[PDB]
Amino acid sequence: LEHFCECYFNLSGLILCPVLGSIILLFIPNSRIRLIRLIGLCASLITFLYSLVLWIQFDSSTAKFQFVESLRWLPYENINFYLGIDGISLFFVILTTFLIPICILVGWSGMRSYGKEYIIAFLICEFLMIAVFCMLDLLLFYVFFESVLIPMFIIIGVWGSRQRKIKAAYQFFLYTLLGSLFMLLAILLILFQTGTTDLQILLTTEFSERRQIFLWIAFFASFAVKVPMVPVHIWLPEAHVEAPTAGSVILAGILLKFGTYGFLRFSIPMFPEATLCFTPFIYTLSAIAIIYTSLTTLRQIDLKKIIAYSSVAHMNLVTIGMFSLNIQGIGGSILLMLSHGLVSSALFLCVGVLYDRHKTRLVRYYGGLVSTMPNFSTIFFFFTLANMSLPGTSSFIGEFLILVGAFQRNSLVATLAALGMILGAAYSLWLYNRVVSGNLKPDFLHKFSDLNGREVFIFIPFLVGLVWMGVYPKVFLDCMHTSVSNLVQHGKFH
């Protein structure tokens, strides 16, 4: 059945944009550095504007999928694949399209040595990740998620700073592939019942409570590695620290969101009974992760290691929210996913600004930077506040909505999750004051430069987005409520 959509701007062209950029860049000599830089930047910016348009034509009243279009693999038409979005996936497409040009801009100064391979890898990542977020089929979700492993592996291994990138890349690839294989096993078990992998159909089939338990575990084994949940979180610090700055931005801001997106998109609505049965288990794992990882964060001595550990606590709060299974919980989980994608990316950008000049991640070398880099200090303080969920910032909305959702289900889990307010403040303020406050240490660092124009411009949209979601989250929540409501209700008829 051809499900071709009426809209002019659709999903397939947004898929095709970075692909065309990559093919063009394949054939341009490395001597033409300016041309390569401009072509990559412009392709990414056009993709971002295309996604913004897709946001305008979005219809915030339906529980259905939108812009649905189809994609036909065999003339037999037994296997035909669909793309479409809703109010849970729209902003993730937008976030991906927004972050990719930021990645191209962060490496602007070093592009003469980076080459076209850097831009091509990031464009391919963009294409694959947008595809992943736009897929109405378990099997293609699988295929497009595993595909990102190759360019991410290359990005970490080639442009990482030091030789620990070897181990970091190995661990990233192997952990993620193990999880992916588990979810492939789940996909095949589903296919044996249903004869299909189309998401819309699986949302309308009934699974046995028993078959649901096994399928839920097999989904959990991928998703908990992706989130990450303890104790399969240890790949994340190594990988997110050893990666280049833009690589860390993509890893934390987008790739981490894929596990929570998988929970929201397949596990909760397809197996509601198993979702109910496992809820105490998820609550326990997430609460343990928040407390233990926050306390580990407190004792880290590397800038990137502190920012990377912080992401584990934030994502497990997201899981608590989404498994609360109400409007506050799921809405807050999605809002915190987007806000984290902005805030952690900005924090990695701040650390990258420091590392590009001074080539150290050890906190002890820095100090007193407020007197030589006041602009960087102010921006760093703002994003530090955002990482503490300060009211007025975007992260507070999601954090408090998730606590609201959890409290209505289980007051103990909400109480353990609200401890994050105390621990995250502690490590965020300690980091900021050890880096920026105090006196300079001229025996380690004596030469300084505040942000140039490119760095200031890079930070501006992050600031605008954080404040915008913090003060008026209605623009986002209005487009999401129908989808969130239908997700919450799926499986029940009262």
Added chain:
Amino acid sequence: PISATMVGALLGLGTQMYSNALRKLPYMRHPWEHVVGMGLGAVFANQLVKWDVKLKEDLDVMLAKARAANERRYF
């Protein structure tokens, strides 16, 4: 639109360029070879499409015979 001829011509041109690159030669070292490659790729792609149609046609009859042989069991 996107015809087999165009896909095949693009693949043949890409093949010549990829071959040149692998040999550390300029992309357009022997351009008449690029023309030859576009022609061969177009021909190959069109023949693959026709072959695919013929293959489905033969598989249909063969599955029909398999089904008849299986249905003979319940007689």
Added chain:
Amino acid sequence: MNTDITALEKAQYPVVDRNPAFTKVVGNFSTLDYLRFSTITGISVTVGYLSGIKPGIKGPSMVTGGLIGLMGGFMYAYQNSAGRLMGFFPNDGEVASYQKR
């Protein structure tokens, strides 16, 4: 020696001659058969010449390639002509010539 030409898969075109004689098959060669024959032989001679230059035997290499091409091209033309007479290949010309003589 007992013989049986009967094939496993039956002919899908009218059978002009079930087991045509060798000379009948050769005399049945059409223009397309000769084109196939000549093309295969010419390509083979060309390959013989080009591959023979480096060893210095381009002439004898041409002869060897030409022998291979002659045998292969004749076998291919015979295959086509016999298959047409037997009804295994489209044989409009054979049927037309048969319905008249």
Added chain:
Amino acid sequence: GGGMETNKNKFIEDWGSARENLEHNFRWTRRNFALIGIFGIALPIIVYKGIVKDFHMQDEDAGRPHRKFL
């Protein structure tokens, strides 16, 4: 004198690299057994039993049987 790069201190780098390679130091000692038994098994089990009881106490407050889990 020359450069924005930090002037490395050997002891600070030794401290950092020792932090990065802690897994080579793990010995299954008595203290480590106790710490993994208490914080890696017992406390998560206690938290899980707390969360479940919370739901069961809600269940009996609503005049409903205990919800089965896991």
Added chain:
Amino acid sequence: GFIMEFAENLVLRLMENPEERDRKAREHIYEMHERCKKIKEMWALPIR
């Protein structure tokens, strides 16, 4: 003329027809619930 009235009209022209979008959605399911039987018959074909 006015910016916003033009913008109103332009945005509505961009958007899916909600009626048609919700109707192909029904054809996919009705066709897929009753179409899910054909392929599983081939997987049960005896190899011998």
Added chain:
Amino acid sequence: SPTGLPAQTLIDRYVTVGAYSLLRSCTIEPECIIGQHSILMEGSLVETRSILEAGSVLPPGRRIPSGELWGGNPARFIRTLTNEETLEIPKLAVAINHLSGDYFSEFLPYSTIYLEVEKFKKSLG
């Protein structure tokens, strides 16, 4: 060579040999810059990530230690290089290769001089 080591001239990777330079049976380790109008004599050795100033003279069997800037006639230690400077050396080599690409693209595989030779011959019978 006077040092007894083998006397081939080895210019390793990412090495920039400045214009008007004279090299005889010297070794240049990877990622070095030789200044313009320099002289490197028999058996001399330039260790990796080192820079010689323009007009330097390195006598037979002399060595330029790694990570250092040298210069003079004869060459003498000037200062130790920073890590940023040593990072710049392969960049200079790559940039010069990029420039050489433009010259490489001006020449087809064959010249047309043989035609001129042909007509010059024909005008002579």
Added chain:
Amino acid sequence: MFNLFLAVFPEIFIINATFILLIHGVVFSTSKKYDYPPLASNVGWLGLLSVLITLLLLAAGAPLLTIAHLFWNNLFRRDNFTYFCQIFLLLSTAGTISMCFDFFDQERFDAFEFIVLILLSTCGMLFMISAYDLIAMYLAIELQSLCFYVIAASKRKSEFSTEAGLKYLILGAFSSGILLFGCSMIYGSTGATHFDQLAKILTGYEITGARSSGIFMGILFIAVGFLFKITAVPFHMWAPDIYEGSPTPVTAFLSIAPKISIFANILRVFIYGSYGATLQQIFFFCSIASMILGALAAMAQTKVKRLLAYSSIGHVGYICIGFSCGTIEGIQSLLIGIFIYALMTMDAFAIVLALRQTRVKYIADLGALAKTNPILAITFSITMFSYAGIPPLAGFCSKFYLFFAALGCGAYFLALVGVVTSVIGCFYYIRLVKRMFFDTPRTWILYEPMDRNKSLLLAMTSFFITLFLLYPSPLFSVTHQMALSLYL
């Protein structure tokens, strides 16, 4: 009478052309006048031509190959399955030959007899595919094997090549004797060697209590010979040593064509015959053993050739899982896995042969390849990721069917083993990518650019590997067709 031989036109042509090339080579290689020219490349080009003409004759005469089937019945059996098997075998032989010319001229391997032996082994494998009797099968297998023994020892002054040949001949002869013993037991128990007669006798009884121990052990011994041939564990250890010690073009040829021919044989013997669950269990246990041992041993390797050998052992384990589950989809998946593994192996050995011009030996010799030849490092990386089975590369098909067969048949231990071994394989495949892209060695090896033949072959196989799953319908249809034609 003459028209009866239309069923063997392809084979007649290739044999006659091989004789012509033998005479040409021996006459002019001994010529003082021509100063004893090397003829390996000249004969190689003429033999590539001969292979392509054979392919034309076979492909264009599809119905004619079945002519006079009653007259030829006690000698061979040609059908749809043998048709496509033989086409794929000829295509593989043509590619392998095309990859040999730089080796001929730069090493100066002047022996044209190498090409003749390859062509005669191709004749043997052609007859293997159409064999329909134990006697014919054994004879064709032996012809193929003797040709390999000779070419494995072609570097006759090399310690490695002579060692390879000696190990191959001894272990090959032993396994062939075991298989022949099995054939003798089956004949003695049934009075038959033709596959049709064996099918009629053995069907409907399998092990009905009063089982012919003669029939049961004949099957077992024949299976042991077959498993030796496909390098299945525990009959595998010849393969890594022979693969490493033989000349690299020999290693490339052995890695592909014999597998095609012997799986044709295995399908038509076992699948078409009847002892049953015992033999599928044989291939089950050997598949699991091959996957585990291939993964671990490949992880141990520091040299490229040995790594590829152990990789092929693991992949034949993956393929034999399809034979084990005994369904039309199992056979189809086995065929798809052979096709895709063959094209990936051709790609990998084209790269290896290109790098052998600078004597690549160790994985570490690939260091800085992403700098000295970026497009070559990317191409080799695509091959590795395809070997690892990362989607949407072509290699993902074998992993997908491995888990598809386990989940359905109820085999959870097989799925477990597949997950573990797939992760191990991915590690040792991406180790190569790390070596080419992430490492910064002090000494680099600069490689000479490859010839046109290998660049073109690499370019086409690299597009196939990246783009196959955009248009996989022809392979899917052709392999379903073949699986069905085994019984109808």
